[PDB]
Design a protein around this ligand. Sequence first.
Ligand SMILES: NC(=O)CSCCCNC(=O)[C@H](CCNC(=O)c1ccc(Cl)s1)NC(=O)Cc1cccc(Cl)c1
Ligand SMILES: *[C@@H]1O[C@H](CO)[C@@H](O)[C@H](O)[C@H]1NC(C)=O
Ligand code: NA
Lengths: 258, 30
Amino acid sequence: IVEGSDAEIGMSPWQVMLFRKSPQELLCGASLISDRWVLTAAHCLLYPPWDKNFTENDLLVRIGKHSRTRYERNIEKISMLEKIYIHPRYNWRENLDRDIALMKLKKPVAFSDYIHPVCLPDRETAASLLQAGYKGRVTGWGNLKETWTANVGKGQPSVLQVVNLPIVERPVCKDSTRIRITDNMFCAGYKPDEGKRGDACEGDSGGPFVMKSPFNNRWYQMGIVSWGEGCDRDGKYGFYTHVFRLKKWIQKVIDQFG
Amino acid sequence: EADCGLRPLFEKKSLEDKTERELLESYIDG
Ligand SMILES: NC(=O)CSCCCNC(=O)[C@H](CCNC(=O)c1ccc(Cl)s1)NC(=O)Cc1cccc(Cl)c1
Ligand SMILES: *[C@@H]1O[C@H](CO)[C@@H](O)[C@H](O)[C@H]1NC(C)=O
Ligand code: NA
């Protein structure tokens, strides 16, 4: 997370870490939507152009973590994957359309003060909240900046990072890039005139874009960290999987297999 | 499950993380 701050403990009890088995390394972020269901981006598991094809036993999910490195014994839970469900029309070849993936845990995880699921938006919440200029919140242990000298130069957070970024007009989003953006994506960040900065970076993908509803004071996941040409560049934006658009699919997957 | 989106350590404890006010102010103005 670029231009971020450390999260408070429990600030994002639904954040999930995707951990690679060998090499023992961080892959991506994700979110907890149920005691046995985890939501993430499809390019975290499958992206052939960079030779990426991760399968169920290739990784594990660490839920309830605060620190990026420390093994948070007795606070975090480590769960293994029963199955991975990647969207059938996920278009990695073109624009990353439908960049979404569900993951069924083998055994249900037990909620704590540090592990709690997020809500998924209904018809109305999507309409009321996903408007240009409203701000949501993005969290992850991703890099603090695009590039940083190998000496010192920070670069990697010690703990989870959090920013609030404003939803940006679809017409502005389409003019920001030459990638064909779709109904399944929405973009967020500050415009260069706005005199403020922030964005996701490498490692934050798959994590959740959330907004707290002003009506029920609940936290809704409106976006999955999807893609961005760089990190916090001026006149560039981060693009997010528009969760409500693909929610009918999320329902089909869980009503069958869950 | 029905308790989704209500964090054990803030909402349930009537507590506010250091930044959720920016989110609320964006709904009205500044
Ligand atoms: N839709 C297309 O096809 C265009 S591809 C995107 C252009 C190449 N990617 C990148 O420059 C960045 C580098 C680090 N920045 C970030 O992580 C993010 C910034 C803001 C948000 Cl929001 S994420 N990575 C990614 O965006 C993630 C990614 C994208 C594709 C494949 C994979 Cl494997 C991973
Ligand atoms: C990914 O690997 C599995 C092997 O477990 C294989 O069956 C599948 O076809 C691979 N997919 C791609 C896109 O390479
Ligand atoms: Na930007």
